[PDB]
């Protein structure tokens, strides 16, 4: 209140309000789901249009052949952070001939976000990200908040009404973790999980965005007629 | 480029400059005008390294034109020549110096006097009744030392200049393709169109 | 007033309120501890299981610096990571110029001076972590604890976070009951117990125990994570004592 | 970090006042009294050594300072501000004059340089004005003996005699009665001691008074012989004993 | 009221942030004292280890700045260590540039100048510490010079700092009024330390065990701190006379 | 190619009884070619005189620079600069270009307005001061000038006698140097009158 | 140039010749090569004369400010350390070769310094083109526990060796004696063994000998009133 | 962070005025009055020192009148220390111009430069403006004798007669009444002193409270002389004009 | 120049000649080439005197500041600081330094840092222009764990020969002994070592 004018000010209970307000922008964002088995990892995202004349805003961004993410919140901030990830994935390949571990990508994002929370003049990032990848230790899913907290998960959801999808995945945990060698079944569980967060509208052919990465599967994004199969 | 001469007579300054431009083996042009008008009563001729000559001259011209507009006033020939000298003196200790020699002929409207300044690429300035750069002086100064009078008319100045150019065309090994001659007096700057 | 709106401003009683507010963020974090044993140090931390969907064993919190130093912290996790990144740079530059790995007291001051620097200006915010760290150098084992003010001292045992009061009292008993000292293996067992005891102040959720150690005899003076059988044995010993 | 205070902390108020300068002058007003008197053949500057505790060795705290061999300074106000200004003044006498002309600056121009430093603390970004007024006494060949006052604003004025700090209004009236253009240096010292006694409460002796003169060249303080033109510094600090001798003749 | 938050003048010509930095100087609740012998300079400070989980060997407010210079600090430890690191850097640099050991009084002046800057520049806060520097200087002999958050410094015959500085100060003043000399007329530093501890006991009206004190001694060409056992031997000699 | 002998020229200064003299030739050339016979090398800032030999662009540049500096000196000090003080200023200014120097040989001459003492000094291109009681020489015929001055000079010459001595030193030195001559000027300086004389000499 | 330094009982002495040259030509017959860094720290320089003067003035200026800052008399080791670090940084491009001598509260000192930044300690030193001639004398007559009078004698004899035997050296001997607990005494032209003999003839001219084209009064006065 | 303590010295008010410029002008209105009058044969500068003491060393004192070069002088009203910063800058610009062109700087070109420097402090940098107004008296061979003023906004204008500092409204009315175009310098001297005599807040106008200067071509033949009056010379011209 | 450092039972000894030349002229015949960077860490210098004095002064500063913060540095640490300066500035330096020191844990240690800035820990080391002539003698006569008197003789005899054959070496033989007992300085004059 008197302590929310900038990111360089703790409140008397030890809170950082500008960061909490940045977190609030994610909550307004459209829902996106992430989950994985031991062979594949999947992103599902509900895209948002402005009106009937407009396009549906893209939610999923490829970072490398083995890694990518989905966003909820300020889209230009996702572009800045995904660009940074592309560069870091790229640096690892060029200098070390090594694919960047998903866990290491999470650490780098945390540290980049943190600096915008401790100095004058800056602002925190106003976007949340779900990062999937397949590296030398298998399939991975990460959740990023602009507080800088990054967490490794079997499944999760962020954005408006993400709580429904998140509870579903919590019950299904023992089922979907075992969907090995069957990409289509893993995506189904993803589309079913995201359905627990819809109201008023349902999943249409220009509404739905899906991405998958795994054992012998480069990170690829499906939109349009390619998601009709799952509708 | 090659020959540039100047002579200050009673009421005017006359600058003569060669027309040839030579890229090593071929004479690429035979009508080149090696001069820039800095202000209505001030003319600068130039010679030296390719590119740098025209770049320097146009840079000086732009600066004097800027001063003229800012103050609504024409700088004296002495003032313009001091500005030019400073620029060359600064340039000689640069990373890559301007390799450019100039003559500045101006009519001072306040004193009602023609003035001729000779400045080399080092920033060496001198005011003279007549001057030159390069080898031009070696062939012409003995004639000018003999015939020059401070009370000569413009036509007598041109005739003494014709004699200088004739001696150059006789004894100089290079074909400089004649000269363009320009007169600076109380009425401004004009080109003698047959020489 | 208004003295608490800007970092580095002295209040009329000579206090820096922004630093005191940073301490509130620390007190809000999970419990972390350190125990200095006969020839080493043990570190342990409580990791709250917010959900089933957290992959077990996968969100590691204790961090190594160089090869002989362990660091754990409570409060804002990103701030702790920022401090460890700096500590890694300080350790690298020390070893680069002087050859020998950075001694623990020398390393303590490097972190201390850096954290203190963030109390000198209003253009930065203090660190929202308390850090427990240490390891083995040429003069033996060393355990330290560093606060948001930049204040640090050496310790026999240390604790921070939400269950800090409970852990302290447990730590004090060990100091009283063992003037001769604790073995590294005993210290691991004791560390597991103390985190289990301190988890009462955080009982809402379940938790995951994480332990690490550097011991002259047990790890050759290198920082290692306690895993597998030795971890299970410490979990079992802890479960017994809370029953 | 970086100093992010790149804006002025001293600004004009609606009434045309520069508040921070006025407040600096108030800090000077609270300061211990110091004075200076100009004679025909010299200048004297003087102040009280108000010791903070009797365990303090107050000879280690020098309120009257040599700036050049022929120029000295005293102050009223904040001591630490004075100390750093003396460091800067000693340096600028070299960097912006002696290293150029091979001689020490004349009094008025060293005053000018100190004044400029004080002006800039009154306009530059992220700083407060200096909380001191200086009295600077000196000699140079072409201007002779002189005495200047410098204020927190950077303004300076030449004086025949003046006082600054606590008891300055009374001291200035005392000085107006006694000053004339025929005073010899000893007369001015005597008047300085009389003037200074009025503003001093406690002990009044060589150990509690700090007094220096600009007078004749002191070849005995040069440190070497053999260069005729070098005749020694004109600045000299009087000893404890030298002050007490003149306090019997009081 | 922003003249209270940064180091600009208040309408009475005061710097409140400096005044409040002086108040932070007593937050540790520790008193220190320094005296001069014929050949030495002794500094003592109370030591309080209120937590049993602390390693008491790491708890200290006395610093070895150079071979010849010691420093005791009154104030919180982060600012104390900030000042200690800087003083160490300055002393080492001085020796490199000018070819001789930095004198105690010159280091004090330098640290006092740095402190003055924090009182004039807005972006920097004052350090909440008082610094007492001691040595046996090669030109000036036994030396005590003390710096504060105002950028003030001066040399002392003897001095005291902390919450109860006045009691210690007056006790010391009374002794020197009697003896009429600027120092403790004693050959050995052991006896000068015993004098220092004795007069702190009188002035504070409290007794000390070996773990309640911290002692630093400066002699010709070195400054050193005493161990608990060297201090015990001091305490024993005090009690036996 | 050697910058200090492209343009040619000389300067000499002498002390006498309550007077000083400073003189120079008037030539400016481009090696073998004579360009100007009116290139004066002596300048004055108040009552202090400065002669400069060497590269002509630097001669002109330094005069403009010392006019600049002595004008500011006067505005601030409220008095004209003295010879001793100006000498230090020339030295300081030249040494600031230690590793990219002005190719010159300056000479200072004047009388201190307070002491009345005659003063002269010379410098190398990098600022080293030569303060001579007797005479100072500079230029492309400096060897010749040293020879003339060493034998013609005697101390305490009256102004009218000093004029003849310095004029003959310059003239005969210049006539043994290809790059010097084409005219000459002599300044006779007393505490409150300065006379300037153009000499008649051979024009080859 | 010939320059020497000699330690004695209670202090140190330095000396130098008084000739400065421009190749083979003598520019100044009575040069002053003994410079003051501070009242009791003097130095003598060989090499590039502008550099020896300049580096001496600069360190002397900084030494004076240091002395004021520390309230202590300047030390020779300070002048030495400041000189060598300045010269080292310029990698020999500042052609200053010096002998530095002085007294301070710590005692009496004698050092030499080379243009690249190296320094040396000694009881007797010599620098310049006449250094080998001077050192031959010093190696022949130096002994431990010299008196002030013996050291002045030895130093000036060493300079004389350079004067008579080295073409780069000549004219007079300058000396400066720095004794502990005393003012430094600078003895300019301590020896004068090279006065020019009277010439055979006077070369004063008859007045009117020189041909004149023009006379004119030069206005050295400022713009006049009224 | 630091924003909290920023006064924002370079912002418009809602009426389109510059706060700090307006407040600097308020400061200047309490400074001693300075007057410049331009005649056909020269210029007069007259200014009142602020309330003096008997112990002030007057003959070595300067607070109002300063020399910029041999042809141009200024009278100061406002903060003296601020003025000396700008004065030294102007002295340098004049020498830069003389070095570049080998001609003395025309009066207006100097005035414009100083005024542009003042303007900059009102538009960028976040610093307080200079609390100074100048009267420039000078001569060049283009426009001859010229008078200008500049103020903290960096605005400048030319005048036949002008005042700055205290009581300019009263002073300007008095000048406008008695000024005539064909007036000479000796007449202008009298007008200037008479005007100060009437507008002063002091009891009487005496020599020790004045600074005085003339710029005349009363230097022999086609050349200009500046005269900063000594205390005795101010005393004489007070008697001669019949004010004391 | 002839310099060497030798480890033995009780610690380490440094040795050097005292000649510095400018071409064929002996600019100083009583030079001290054994320089102290810490109480019991000394070095022998060879190459550019300006470079090695500058380097040693910087190292002494680094170790003074190290000591103030972290206590007594090891001989290895001192060698590392020398190396860092010699390696990173190899284009602009001509320095060949031997570092020798005594610890109570490690006892006597010797490191040599030749021209390129490499470091080599050795039982003993030789360097300078005169060392070339005693590679054979030193390799045949060095033993580990010699006594103090034996080690002094070994260095004295070794540098005796280096001085004999190398015109750039000569004067007195200086030595510095580093043990637990302290720091001892020795000097040996020509009339002694020439007759060996
Ligand atoms: Mg030319
Ligand atoms: Mg501050
Ligand atoms: Mg000739
Ligand atoms: Mg010819
Ligand atoms: Mg000729
Ligand atoms: Mg080199
Ligand atoms: Mg040999």
UniProtKB/Swiss-Prot annotation, chain A:
From what organism does this protein derive?
Saccharomyces cerevisiae (strain ATCC 204508 / S288c) (Baker's yeast)
Decide whether keyword Transmembrane is in the record: no
One Gene Ontology cellular component annotation held by this UniProt entry: proteasome complex
This protein's record includes keyword Metal-binding: no
| Phosphoserine: residues carrying this PTM | 11
Stated name of the protein: Proteasome subunit alpha type-6
Tell me the Gene3D superfamilies matching this sequence: Glutamine Phosphoribosylpyrophosphate, subunit 1, domain 1
Could you share any additional remarks the record makes about this protein? Present with 7210 molecules/cell in log phase SD medium.
Q: Which family does it belong to?
A: Belongs to the peptidase T1A family.
In terms of PANTHER family, this protein maps to:
PROTEASOME SUBUNIT ALPHA/BETA
Question: Which cellular compartments is it found in?
Answer: Cytoplasm; Nucleus
Q: Which UniProt keywords apply?
A: Cytoplasm, Isopeptide bond, Nucleus, Phosphoprotein, Proteasome, Ubl conjugation
* Cross-referenced Pfam families: Proteasome (PF00227), Proteasome_A_N (PF10584)
Q: Which GO terms describe its biological process?
A: proteasomal ubiquitin-independent protein catabolic process; proteasome-mediated ubiquitin-dependent protein catabolic process
Q: Quaternary state and partners of this protein?
A: The 26S proteasome consists of a 20S proteasome core and two 19S regulatory subunits. The 20S proteasome core is composed of 28 subunits that are arranged in four stacked rings, resulting in a barrel-shaped structure. The two end rings are each formed by seven alpha subunits, and the two central rings are each formed by seven beta subunits. The catalytic chamber with the active sites is on the inside of the barrel.
Q: Where do the TM regions start and end? A: none
Note the position of the cross-link Glycyl lysine isopeptide (Lys-Gly) (interchain with G-Cter in ubiquitin): 188
UniProtKB/Swiss-Prot annotation, chain C:
Major location (coarse): cytoplasm
What residue ranges are annotated as transmembrane? none
Q: How is it modified after translation?
A: The alpha and beta forms are probably products of the same gene with different post-translational modifications.
The places in or outside the cell where this protein is found are: Cytoplasm; Nucleus
Q: What do the Gene Ontology cellular component annotations say?
A: nucleus; proteasome complex; proteasome core complex, alpha-subunit complex; proteasome storage granule
Keyword Repressor among UniProt keywords: no
- GO annotation terms (biological process): proteasomal ubiquitin-independent protein catabolic process; proteasome-mediated ubiquitin-dependent protein catabolic process
Respond yes or no to whether keyword 4Fe-4S is given for this record. Answer: no
The entry's keywords: Acetylation, Cytoplasm, Nucleus, Proteasome
GO terms assigned for molecular function:
mRNA binding
Instruction: State what this protein does.
Output: The proteasome degrades poly-ubiquitinated proteins in the cytoplasm and in the nucleus. It is essential for the regulated turnover of proteins and for the removal of misfolded proteins. The proteasome is a multicatalytic proteinase complex that is characterized by its ability to cleave peptides with Arg, Phe, Tyr, Leu, and Glu adjacent to the leaving group at neutral or slightly basic pH. It has an ATP-dependent proteolytic activity.
The family classification in the record reads:
Belongs to the peptidase T1A family.
Q: What else is known?
A: Present with 12000 molecules/cell in log phase SD medium.
* Protein known as: Probable proteasome subunit alpha type-7
Taxonomic lineage per UniProt? Answer: Eukaryota, Fungi, Dikarya, Ascomycota, Saccharomycotina
| Gene, per the UniProt record | PRE10
Swiss-Prot record, chain D:
PROSITE patterns, from UniProt? Answer: PROTEASOME_ALPHA_1 (PS00388), PROTEASOME_ALPHA_2 (PS51475)
Q: Name one GO biological process term.
A: proteasome-mediated ubiquitin-dependent protein catabolic process
Signal peptide (residue range): none
Database matches in Gene3D superfamilies: Glutamine Phosphoribosylpyrophosphate, subunit 1, domain 1
**Family matches, as InterPro entries:** Ntn_hydrolases_N, Proteasome_alpha, Proteasome_alpha-type, Proteasome_asu_N, Proteasome_sua/b
Which key words are in the record? Answer: Cytoplasm, Isopeptide bond, Nucleus, Proteasome, Ubl conjugation
Please tell me one Gene Ontology term that the record gives under cellular component: proteasome storage granule
Biological function:
The proteasome degrades poly-ubiquitinated proteins in the cytoplasm and in the nucleus. It is essential for the regulated turnover of proteins and for the removal of misfolded proteins. The proteasome is a multicatalytic proteinase complex that is characterized by its ability to cleave peptides with Arg, Phe, Tyr, Leu, and Glu adjacent to the leaving group at neutral or slightly basic pH. It has an ATP-dependent proteolytic activity.
Assembly and interaction partners: The 26S proteasome consists of a 20S proteasome core and two 19S regulatory subunits. The 20S proteasome core is composed of 28 subunits that are arranged in four stacked rings, resulting in a barrel-shaped structure. The two end rings are each formed by seven alpha subunits, and the two central rings are each formed by seven beta subunits. The catalytic chamber with the active sites is on the inside of the barrel.
Gene name, Swiss-Prot/TrEMBL: PRE8
From Swiss-Prot, chain G:
Q: Name one GO molecular function term.
A: endopeptidase activity
Q: Which reaction does it catalyse?
A: Cleavage of peptide bonds with very broad specificity
Keyword Hydrolase, does the record have it? yes
Q: Which domain of life is it from?
A: Eukaryota
- Alphabetically ordered keywords of this record: Cytoplasm, Hydrolase, Nucleus, Protease, Proteasome, Threonine protease, Zymogen
Q: Does the keyword Coiled coil apply?
A: no
- Give its E.C. classification number: 3.4.25.1
Q: Name one GO cellular component term.
A: proteasome storage granule
User: What more does the record tell us?
Assistant: The side chain of Thr-1 acts as a nucleophile, and the N-terminal amino group acts as a proton acceptor.
* Oligomeric and partner information: The 26S proteasome consists of a 20S proteasome core and two 19S regulatory subunits. The 20S proteasome core is composed of 28 subunits that are arranged in four stacked rings, resulting in a barrel-shaped structure. The two end rings are each formed by seven alpha subunits, and the two central rings are each formed by seven beta subunits. The catalytic chamber with the active sites is on the inside of the barrel.
Question: According to its UniProt entry, what is the function of this protein?
Answer: The proteasome degrades poly-ubiquitinated proteins in the cytoplasm and in the nucleus. It is essential for the regulated turnover of proteins and for the removal of misfolded proteins. The proteasome is a multicatalytic proteinase complex that is characterized by its ability to cleave peptides with Arg, Phe, Tyr, Leu, and Glu adjacent to the leaving group at neutral or slightly basic pH. It has an ATP-dependent proteolytic activity.
The Swiss-Prot or TrEMBL record describes its family as follows: Belongs to the peptidase T1B family.
Q: What is this protein called?
A: Proteasome subunit beta type-2
């Amino acid at each position: 209140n008197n302590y929310d004018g900038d990111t360089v000010t703790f409140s008397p209970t030890g809170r950082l309000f500008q960061v909490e307000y940045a977190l609030e922008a994610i909550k307004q964002g459209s829902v996106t789901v992430g989950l994985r088995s031991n062979t594949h990892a999947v992103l599902v995202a509900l895209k948002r249009n402005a009106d009937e004349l407009s396009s549906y805003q893209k939610k999923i961004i490829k970072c490398d052949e083995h890694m990518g993410l989905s966003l909820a919140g300020l889209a230009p901030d996702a572009r800045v952070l995904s660009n940074y990830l592309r560069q870091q994935c790229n640096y690892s390949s060029l200098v070390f001939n090594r694919k960047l571990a998903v866990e290491r990508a999470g650490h780098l994002l945390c540290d980049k976000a943190q600096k915008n929370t401790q100095s004058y003049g800056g602002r925190p990032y106003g976007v949340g990200l779900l990062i999937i990848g397949y590296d030398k230790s298998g399939a991975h899913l990460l959740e990023f908040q602009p507080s800088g907290n990054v967490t490794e998960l079997y499944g999760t959801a962020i954005g408006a009404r993400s709580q429904g999808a998140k509870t579903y995945l919590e019950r299904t945990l023992d089922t979907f973790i075992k969907i090995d060698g069957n990409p289509d079944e893993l995506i189904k569980a993803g589309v079913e999980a995201i359905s627990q967060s819809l109201r008023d509208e349902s999943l249409t052919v220009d509404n739905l965005s899906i991405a998958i990465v795994g054992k012998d599967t480069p990170f690829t994004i499906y939109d349009g007629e390619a998601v009709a199969k799952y509708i | 480029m090659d020959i540039i001469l100047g002579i200050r007579v009673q009421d005017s300054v006359i600058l003569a400059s060669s027309k040839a431009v030579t890229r090593g083996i071929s004479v690429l042009k035979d009508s080149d005008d090696k001069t820039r008008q800095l202000s209505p009563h001030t003319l600068m001729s130039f010679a030296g390294e390719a590119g740098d000559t025209v770049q320097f001259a146009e840079y000086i011209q732009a600066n004097i034109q800027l001063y003229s507009i800012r103050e609504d006033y024409e700088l004296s020939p002495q003032a313009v020549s001091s500005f030019v000298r400073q620029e060359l003196a600064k340039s000689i200790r640069s990373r890559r110096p301007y390799q450019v020699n100039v003559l500045i002929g101006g009519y001072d409207k306040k004193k009602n006097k023609p003035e001729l300044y000779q400045i080399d690429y080092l920033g060496t300035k001198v005011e003279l009744p007549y001057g030159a750069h390069g080898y031009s002086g070696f062939y012409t100064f003995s004639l000018l030392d003999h015939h020059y009078r401070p009370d000569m008319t413009t036509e007598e100045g041109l005739d003494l200049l014709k004699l200088c150019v004739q001696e150059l065309e006789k004894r100089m090994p290079m074909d400089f393709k004649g000269v363009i001659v320009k007169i600076v007096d109380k009425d401004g700057i004009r080109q003698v169109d047959d020489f | 007033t208004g003295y608490d709106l800007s970092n580095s401003v002295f209040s009329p009683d000579g206090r820096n309120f922004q630093v005191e507010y940073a301490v509130k963020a620390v007190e809000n974090g999970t419990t972390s501890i350190g125990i200095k044993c006969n020839d080493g140090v043990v570190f342990a931390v409580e990791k709250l299981i917010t959900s089933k969907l957290l992959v077990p064993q996968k969100n590691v919190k204790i961090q190594v610096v160089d090869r002989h130093i362990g660091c754990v912290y409570s409060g804002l996790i990103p701030d702790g990571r920022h401090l460890v990144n700096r500590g890694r740079e300080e350790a690298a530059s020390f070893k680069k110029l002087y050859k020998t790995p950075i001694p623990i007291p020398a390393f303590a001051d490097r972190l201390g001076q850096y954290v203190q620097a963030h109390t000198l200006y209003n253009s930065v915010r203090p660190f929202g972590v308390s850090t427990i760290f240490g390891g083995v150098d040429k003069n033996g084992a060393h355990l330290y604890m560093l606060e948001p003010s930049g204040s640090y001292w050496g310790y026999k045992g240390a604790a921070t976070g939400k269950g800090r009061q409970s852990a302290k009292a447990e730590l004090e008993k060990l100091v009283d009951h063992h003037p001769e000292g604790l073995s590294a293996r005993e210290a691991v067992k004791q560390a597991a117990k103390i985190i289990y005891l301190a988890h009462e102040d955080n009982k809402e959720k379940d938790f995951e125990l994480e332990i690490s150690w550097c011991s002259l005899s047990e790890t050759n003076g290198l920082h290692k994570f306690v895993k597998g059988d030795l971890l299970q044995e410490a979990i079992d010993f802890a479960q017994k004592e809370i029953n | 970090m970086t100093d992010r205070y790149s804006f002025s902390l001293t600004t004009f108020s609606p009434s045309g006042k520069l508040g921070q300068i006025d407040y600096a002058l108030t800090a000077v007003k609270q300061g211990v009294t110091s004075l200076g008197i100009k004679a025909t053949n010299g200048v004297v500057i003087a102040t009280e050594k108000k010791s903070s505790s009797p365990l303090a060795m107050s000879e280690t705290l020098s309120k009257v300072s040599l700036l050049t061999p022929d120029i000295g300074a005293v102050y009223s106000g904040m001591g630490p501000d004075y100390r750093v200004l003396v460091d800067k003044s000693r340096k600028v006498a070299h960097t912006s004059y002696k290293r150029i002309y091979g001689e020490y600056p004349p009094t008025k121009l060293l005053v000018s340089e100190v004044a400029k430093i004080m002006q800039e603390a009154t306009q530059s970004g992220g700083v407060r004005p200096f909380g001191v007024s200086l009295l600077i006494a000196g000699h140079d060949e072409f201007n002779g003996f002189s005495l200047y006052q410098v204020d927190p604003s950077g303004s300076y004025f030449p004086w025949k005699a003046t006082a600054i700090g606590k008891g300055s209004v009374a001291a200035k009236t005392f000085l107006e009665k006694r000053w004339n253009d025929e005073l010899e240096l000893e007369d001015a010292i005597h008047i300085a001691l009389l003037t200074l006694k009025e503003s001093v409460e406690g002990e009044f002796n060589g150990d509690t008074i700090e007094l220096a003169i600009i007078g004749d060249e002191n070849p005995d303080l040069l440190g070497y012989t053999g260069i005729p033109t070098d005749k020694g510094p004109r600045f000299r600090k009087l000893t404890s004993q030298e002050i007490n001798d003149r306090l019997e003749a009081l | 009221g922003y003249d209270r938050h940064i180091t600009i003048f208040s309408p009475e010509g005061r710097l409140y942030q400096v005044e409040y930095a002086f108040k932070a100087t007593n937050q540790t609740n520790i008193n220190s004292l320094a005296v001069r012998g014929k050949d030495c300079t002794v500094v003592i400070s109370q030591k309080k280890v209120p937590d049993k989980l602390l390693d008491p060997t790491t708890v200290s407010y006395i610093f070895c700045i150079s071979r010849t210079i010691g420093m005791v600090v009154n104030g919180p430890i982060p600012d104390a260590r900030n000042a200690a690191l800087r003083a160490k850097a300055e002393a080492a640099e001085f020796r490199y540039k000018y070819g001789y050991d930095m004198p105690c009084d010159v280091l004090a002046k330098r640290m006092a100048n740095l402190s003055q800057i924090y009182t004039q520049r807005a972006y920097m806060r004052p350090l909440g510490v008082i610094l007492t520097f001691v040595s046996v200087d090669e030109e000036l002999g036994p030396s005590i010079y003390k710096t504060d958050p105002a950028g003030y410094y001066v040399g002392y015959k003897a001095t005291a700092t902390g919450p109860k500085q006045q009691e210690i100060t007056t006790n010391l003043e009374n002794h020197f009024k009697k003896s009429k000399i600027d120092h403790i007329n004693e050959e050995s530093w052991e006896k000068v330390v015993e004098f220092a501890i004795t007069h702190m006991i009188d002035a504070l009206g409290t007794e000390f065990s070996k773990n309640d004190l911290e002692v630093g001694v400066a002699t010709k060409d070195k400054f050193f701190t005493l161990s608990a056992e060297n201090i015990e031997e001091r305490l024993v000699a005090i009690a036996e006379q | 190619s050697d910058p200090s002998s492209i343009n040619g020229g000389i300067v000499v200064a002498m002390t006498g009884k309550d007077c000083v003299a400073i003189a120079c030739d008037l030539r400016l050339g481009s090696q073998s070619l004579g360009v100007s016979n009116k290139f004066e090398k002596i300048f004055h800032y108040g009552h202090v005189f400065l002669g400069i030999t060497g590269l002509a662009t630097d001669v002109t540049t330094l005069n403009e620079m010392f006019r600049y500096k002595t004008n500011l000196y006067k505005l601030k000090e409220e008095r004209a600069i003295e010879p001793e003080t100006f000498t230090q200023l020339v030295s300081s200014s030249l040494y600031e270009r230690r590793f990219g120097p002005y190719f010159v040989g300056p000479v200072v001459a004047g009388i201190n307005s307070k002491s009345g003492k005659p003063f002269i000094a010379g410098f190398d291109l990098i600022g080293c001061i030569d303060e001579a009681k007797d005479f100072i020489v500079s230029g492309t015929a400096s060897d010749q000038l040293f020879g003339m001055c060493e034998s013609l000079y005697e101390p305490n010459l009256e102004p009218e006698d000093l004029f003849e001595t310095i004029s003959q030193a310059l003239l005969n030195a210049a006539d043994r140097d290809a790059l010097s001559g084409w005219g000459a000027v002599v300044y006779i300086i007393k505490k409150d009158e300065v006379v300037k004389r153009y000499l008649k000499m051979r024009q080859d | 140039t010939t320059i020497v330094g000699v330690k004695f009982n209670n202090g140190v002495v330095i000396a130098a010749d008084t000739r400065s040259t421009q190749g083979p030509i003598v520019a100044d017959k009575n040069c002053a090569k003994l410079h003051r860094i501070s009242p009791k720290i003097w130095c003598a320089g060989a090499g590039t004369a502008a550099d020896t003067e300049a580096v001496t003035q600069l360190i002397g200026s900084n030494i004076e400010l240091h002395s004021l800052y520390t309230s202590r008399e300047p030390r020779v080791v300070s002048a030495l350390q400041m000189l060598k670090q300045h010269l080292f940084k310029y990698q020999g491009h500042i052609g200053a070769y010096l002998i530095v001598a002085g007294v301070d509260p710590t005692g009496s000192h004698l050092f030499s310094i080379h243009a690249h930044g190296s320094t040396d300690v000694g009881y007797y030193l010599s620098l310049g083109s006449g250094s080998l001639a001077a050192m031959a004398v010093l190696e022949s007559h130096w002994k431990q526990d010299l008196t002030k009078e013996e050291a002045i004698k030895l130093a000036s004899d060493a300079i004389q060796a350079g004067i008579w035997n080295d073409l780069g050296s000549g004219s007079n001997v300058d000396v400066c004696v720095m004794e502990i607990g005393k003012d430094a005494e600078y003895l300019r032209n301590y020896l004068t063994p090279n006065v020019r003999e009277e010439k055979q003839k006077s070369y004063k001219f008859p007045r009117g000998t020189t041909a004149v084209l023009k006379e004119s009064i030069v206005n050295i006065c400022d713009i006049q009133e009224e | 962070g630091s924003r909290r303590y920023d006064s924002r010295t370079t912002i418009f008010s809602p009426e389109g005025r510059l706060y700090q410029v307006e407040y600097a002008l308020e400061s200047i209105s309490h400074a001693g009055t300075a007057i410049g009058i331009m005649a056909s044969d020269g210029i007069v500068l007259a200014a009142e020192r602020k309330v003096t003491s008997t112990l002030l060393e007057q003959d070595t004192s300067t607070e109002k009148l300063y020399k910029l070069n041999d042809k141009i002088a200024v009278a100061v009203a406002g903060l003296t220390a601020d003025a000396e910063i700008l004065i030294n800058t102007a002295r340098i610009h004049a020498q830069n111009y003389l070095k570049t062109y080998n001609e003395d700087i025309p009066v207006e070109i100097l005035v414009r430069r100083l005024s542009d420097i003042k303007q900059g402090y009102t538009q960028h940098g976040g610093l307080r403006p200079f609390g100074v107004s100048f009267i420039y008296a000078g001569y060049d061979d283009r426009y001859g004798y010229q008078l200008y003023t500049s103020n903290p906004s960096g605005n400048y204008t030319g005048w036949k007669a002008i005042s700055v500092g205290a009581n300019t409204s009263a002073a300007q009315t008095l000048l406008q009444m008695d000024y005539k175009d064909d007036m000479k310098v000796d007449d202008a001297i009298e007008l200037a002193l008479k005007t100060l005599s009437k507008t002063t807040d002091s009891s009487a106008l005496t020599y020790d409270r004045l600074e005085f200067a003339t710029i005349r071509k009363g230097a022999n033949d086609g050349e200009v002389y500046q005269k900063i009056f000594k205390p005795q010379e101010i005393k004489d011209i007070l008697v001669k004009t019949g004010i004391t | 120049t002839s310099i060497m450092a030798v480890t033995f039972k009780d610690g380490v000894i440094l040795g050097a000649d005292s000649r510095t030349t400018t071409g064929a002229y002996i600019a100083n015949r009583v030079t001290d080439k054994l320089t102290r960077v810490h109480d019991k860490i000394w070095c022998c210098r060879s190459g550019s005197a300006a470079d090695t004095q500058a380097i040693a002064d910087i190292v002494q500063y680094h170790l003074e500041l190290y000591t103030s913060q972290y206590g007594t540095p090891s001989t290895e640490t001192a060698a590392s600081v020398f190396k860092e300066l010699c390696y990173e500035n190899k284009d602009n330096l001509t320095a060949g330094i031997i570092v020798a020191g005594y610890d109570d844990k490690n006892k006597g240690e010797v490191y040599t840092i030749p021209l390129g800035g490499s470091v080599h820990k050795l039982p003993y080391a030789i360097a300078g222009s005169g060392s070339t002539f005693i590679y054979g003698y030193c390799d045949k006569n060095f033993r580990e764990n010699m006594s103090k008197e034996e080690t002094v003789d070994f260095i004295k005899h070794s540098l005796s020969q280096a001085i004999k054959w190398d015109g750039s070496s000569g004067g007195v033989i200086r030595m510095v002994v580093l043990t637990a007992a302290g720091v001892e300085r020795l000097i040996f004059y020509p009339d002694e070592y020439e007759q060996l």
